[PDB]
RNA sequence: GGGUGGGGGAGUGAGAAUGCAGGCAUGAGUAGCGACAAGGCAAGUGAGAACCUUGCCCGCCGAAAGACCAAGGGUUCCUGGGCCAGGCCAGUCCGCCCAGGGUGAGUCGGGACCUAAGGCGAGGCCGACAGGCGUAGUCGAUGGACAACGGGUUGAUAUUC
RNA sequence: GGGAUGAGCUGUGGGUAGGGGUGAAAGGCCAAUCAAACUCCGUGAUAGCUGGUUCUCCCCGAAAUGCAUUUAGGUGCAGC
């Protein structure tokens, strides 16, 4: 995106900020011993990257 | 009031197996699900003016399908496989040459 | 044994921060005129062309 | 050779015997094998000793090799080509090269092959 | 290690079926009350 | 959609009930990933392969872990697709998802034949009512009687074609 | 480890139902529940017992004693 949309130089790009936030969580069931039922969480992420051009 | 032989036979069956049996001169029809073999044989003879050696039948249940949250079922059907006498005129299905 | 109390934020974070990936070191390789970087243990494979740089 | 220190490959040691023999057969048949690094490191001296028997090349050596290998085609090719090819080299008939690990279990991989 | 439910369609019908429910006034009331509640199956 | 004032009326105020519902933490990137038969190499496919396909080695069962039924299940069978859910990992694979196709009987297993235990039971007897029991009768196989064998063929049926 | 031609084991079909059944008898079993099953209704059973009871400020401010009690961890009257 930086090189195409912004017309920047790829050799100057540095990963300025990057982080991973939480997405929605799906819930499942794992059967355990003696009629117990435990919950299993399927987590997802939102990953955000901001590259910037600087000498 | 009056009975017509054409109310028993609904449609031909169009498939690879059916096309394979056309080469043998055996025809497959969907019949009304409460008819019997003798009735189907009489009806075919009357309609297509042809000799019939034997008629075989089979029921088939409908498939279950789910659309939004719960299953739904298709209709059950009864197929009739009709083999002609050895030397009778072929039946022209008018669009099923095989 | 069961945990008697829930851990405070500070105590949870002290132990949680020590779970981390170790970073491997990369050295330069010139194969087929192009320059790449591979871990030093894969130098022979890179020079013989057994490494797939995708 | 020197026995394994620690748990054997593939479970028991009756399995390790077969693993080593199969790896040796494949190596002599193809000249080059890709496998996990521990298996290749365990294979190296095992295969070098068979090559030494083939270099000696008598009927007793052939019987001794047939003790471990079961593929007569590979025995024949080892006694006809690999032995005479290495007649002028004093050990070090194989070479191990490390490769990128594989997905699934991140097992380290290596290739073992004869020198030429 | 045998469990309580051993399916058998003929026995299920002969023990809980429509013709059995309709043979006694208690079963007739059961069918009527399931109708009143609006059940799919009686 | 609100403010202020005179009045009127309240499902009018929560921190606690091992309270109820929903979302989310701590334990914690921890336990576990379900038999003590065992996997490996080469090639392929593919964006991606420990697990999919092909070949060859190796190993296990073999009074079964092989081959047929009954009950039960209900399309899970075959072909062509699919790959964000599921499969205790991954998956290009699948008993998962989508579409289409697929089950052919005078003789096989049942009915249209027979009855057993038992059930229902015209009249009937008994019982304040509700109802109980039962004759004639009629149902009720797990039993009796009664006619087919061998080969071939499809991706999927075959003592059925 | 016990029995393994017997008072055997087992399939299919049937019968006995709650103060009732069945029991080579242990109060055992009768759908993971049995010194009287389960469901719905009476029903929002009752509990001298345990718990809970939600905004504010101003004034005053105790008792844990007597008598009686199928009473003594409850209540009535007095005292405060
Ligand atoms: Mg269970
Ligand atoms: Mg009409
Ligand atoms: Mg025929
Ligand atoms: Mg039929
Ligand atoms: Mg489907
Ligand atoms: Mg040792
Ligand atoms: Mg291990
Ligand atoms: Mg042994
Ligand atoms: Mg307001
Ligand atoms: Mg007002
Ligand atoms: Mg309120
Ligand atoms: Mg609150
Ligand atoms: Mg609370
Ligand atoms: Mg711990
Ligand atoms: Mg573990
Ligand atoms: Mg497993
Ligand atoms: Mg490969
Ligand atoms: Mg399949
Ligand atoms: Mg998937
Ligand atoms: Mg997965
Ligand atoms: Mg009467
Ligand atoms: Mg009666
Ligand atoms: Mg009778
Ligand atoms: Mg009958
Ligand atoms: Mg029978
Ligand atoms: Mg088949
Ligand atoms: Mg019964
Ligand atoms: Mg006692
Ligand atoms: Mg019980
Ligand atoms: Mg009772
Ligand atoms: Mg009682
Ligand atoms: Mg009352
Ligand atoms: Mg004061």
From Swiss-Prot, chain A:
UniProt signal peptide: none
GO CC field: cytosolic large ribosomal subunit; peptidoglycan-based cell wall
Gene Ontology process terms (BP): translation
GO molecular function: rRNA binding; structural constituent of ribosome
Keywords: Acetylation, Ribonucleoprotein, Ribosomal protein, RNA-binding, rRNA-binding
Source species, domain of life: Bacteria
Keyword Ribonucleoprotein attached: yes
Remaining remarks: Was identified as a high-confidence drug target.
Its biological purpose: This protein binds specifically to 23S rRNA; its binding is stimulated by other ribosomal proteins, e.g. L4, L17, and L20. It is important during the early stages of 50S assembly. It makes multiple contacts with different domains of the 23S rRNA in the assembled 50S subunit and ribosome.
Family note: Belongs to the universal ribosomal protein uL22 family.
Oligomeric form and interacting partners: Part of the 50S ribosomal subunit.
Identification of the protein by name: Large ribosomal subunit protein uL22
The encoding gene: rplV
Swiss-Prot record, chain B:
PROSITE patterns: RIBOSOMAL_L23
One Pfam family cited in the UniProt record for this chain: Ribosomal_L23
InterPro entries (alphabetical): Nucleotide-bd_a/b_plait_sf, Ribosomal_uL23-like, Ribosomal_uL23/eL15/eS24_sf, Ribosomal_uL23_CS
Keyword terms: Ribonucleoprotein, Ribosomal protein, RNA-binding, rRNA-binding
GO BP annotation list: translation
GO (cellular component) term, any one: plasma membrane
Taxonomy, superkingdom: Bacteria
An MF annotation (GO) of this entry: rRNA binding
Entries under NCBIfam families matching the protein: PRK05738.2-4, PRK05738.2-5
Similarity comment: Belongs to the universal ribosomal protein uL23 family.
Subunit structure: Part of the 50S ribosomal subunit. Contacts protein L29, and trigger factor when it is bound to the ribosome.
Function statement: One of the early assembly proteins it binds 23S rRNA. One of the proteins that surrounds the polypeptide exit tunnel on the outside of the ribosome. Forms the main docking site for trigger factor binding to the ribosome.
Additional remarks: Was identified as a high-confidence drug target.
PANTHER family named among the record's database cross-references: 60S RIBOSOMAL PROTEIN L23A
Protein's name in the database: Large ribosomal subunit protein uL23
Gene: rplW
UniProtKB/Swiss-Prot annotation, chain C:
Disordered as annotated region, ranges: 1-21
Biased composition (Basic residues): 1-18
Gene Ontology MF, one: structural constituent of ribosome
Keyword set, alphabetical order: Ribonucleoprotein, Ribosomal protein
Record-level GO BP terms: translation
Entry's Gene Ontology cellular component terms: large ribosomal subunit
UniProt keyword Ribosomal protein present: yes
Source organism superkingdom: Bacteria
Family of this protein: Belongs to the bacterial ribosomal protein bL32 family.
HAMAP family (UniProt xref): Ribosomal_bL32
UniProt-listed NCBIfam families: rpmF_bact
Annotated protein name in UniProt: Large ribosomal subunit protein bL32
Swiss-Prot record, chain E:
Classification via Gene3D superfamilies: 1.10.287.3980
Entry's Gene Ontology molecular function annotations: structural constituent of ribosome
Keyword Ribonucleoprotein belongs to the record: yes
Highest taxon of source: Bacteria
GO biological process, one term: translation
Statement: the UniProt record of this protein carries the keyword Ribonucleoprotein: yes
Cellular component GO terms, alphabetical: ribonucleoprotein complex; ribosome
Lineage: Bacteria, Bacillati, Actinomycetota, Actinomycetes, Mycobacteriales
Homology family: Belongs to the bacterial ribosomal protein bL34 family.
Protein name, UniProt field: Large ribosomal subunit protein bL34
Alphabetically ordered keywords of this record: Ribonucleoprotein, Ribosomal protein
